[PDB]
């Protein structure tokens, strides 16, 4: 089976043992568990359950792997030609690595 669930404002396909990268979760340590009860569609080999608001009974439980994973560095450049204005900053996005255990 696979499911679509809204984890941290993002809808993802989830299967048992996937190691998904999601937006950074605050106040977690490696090995902690997290629940996600926002299943929109369930597709277990032939029969589809479409959630109107939600599937209402489906959820996924994940084991946190890495509390803090940093995305690649992106250079943010602003410039207005012939005016002298110029600035350059660096950005890294923050993620959390989770391993899906059960698709209950």
């Amino acid at each position: 089976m696979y499911v679509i669930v809204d984890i941290q404002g993002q809808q993802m396909k989830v299967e048992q043992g996937r190691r998904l990268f999601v937006h950074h979760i605050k106040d977690v340590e490696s090995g902690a568990s997290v629940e996600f009860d926002k299943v929109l569609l369930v597709d277990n080999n032939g029969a589809i359950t479409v959630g109107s608001p939600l599937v209402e009974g489906a959820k996924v439980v994940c084991e946190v792997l890495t509390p803090l994973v940093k995305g690649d560095k992106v250079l943010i450049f602003h410039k207005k030609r012939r005016k002298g204005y110029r600035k350059l900053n660096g950005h890294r996005q923050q993620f959390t690595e989770i391993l899906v255990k059960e698709v209950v």
């Binding site: 002298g84 204005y85 110029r86 600035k87």
Partner: protein, 49 residues
């Protein structure tokens, strides 16, 4: 104790340095505006004028 000297907070300050690039906010025209008498080297105010 010559290895750990410290002055009082807010007692020393760095000096202004102009004409050294855009990021400082003091480069290019170096706080002088664009043209006219006041922008030139050697301008001084005529006190009574």
């Amino acid at each position: 104790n010559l290895s750990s000297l410290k002055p009082a907070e807010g007692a020393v300050k760095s000096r202004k340095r102009i004409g050294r690039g855009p990021g400082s906010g003091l480069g290019g025209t170096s706080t002088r505006g664009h043209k006219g008498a006041k922008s030139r080297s050697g301008y001084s105010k005529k006190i009574g004028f």
